[PDB]
Amino acid sequence: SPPPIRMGVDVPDRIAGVAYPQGTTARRLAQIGAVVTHDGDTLTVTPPSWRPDLRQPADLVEEVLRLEGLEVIPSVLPPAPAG
Amino acid sequence: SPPPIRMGVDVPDRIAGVAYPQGTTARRLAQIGAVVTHDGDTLTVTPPSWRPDLRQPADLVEEVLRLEGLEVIPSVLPPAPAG
Ligand SMILES: [Mg+2]
Ligand SMILES: [Mg+2]
Ligand SMILES: [Mg+2]
């Protein structure tokens, strides 16, 4: 197994701009074959041996979002500073 | 005397973008000749008879800001929406 990954439980929610139902991240990361232990607000994710691409939290964020579906992500125009 | 005017004590601070020291609004408004009474966060200002121009909270804000000096107002570039 690759080394374990530490990630805040709401990190996929922040990247997506979507409040996912409770347990969505741990469930999705379990589906792809990773062992997920819950420690307060920090998940400890150990990806399976067939997923060496999962090395950082951003890698784990992609697994959650792509299984929940990118269509749920809303469209929010950012304000850029005065150029 | 004109009718009295109700205004939040920090309304001049909000318009100016400056946190004035405690009691600045009440003191400045007394100087110009108005009777000021407190009630929590609301001031009741009765302008003097020689100031029929003082009719709305914005009129009182001008008195506070111009006596404190407009030079203390900082420069904050507002973010406009995507045009
Ligand atoms: Mg990836
Ligand atoms: Mg990568
Ligand atoms: Mg005026």
From Swiss-Prot, chains A, B:
Family: Belongs to the phenylalanyl-tRNA synthetase beta subunit family. Type 1 subfamily.
Section of the entire sequence shown: 415 to 497 of 831
Residues the record lists as binding Mg(2+): D53, D59, E62, E63
Quaternary structure and interacting proteins, as annotated: Tetramer of two alpha and two beta subunits.
Span of domain B5: 1-75
Note: Was identified as a high-confidence drug target.
Descriptive protein name: Phenylalanine--tRNA ligase beta subunit
Places the protein is found: Cytoplasm
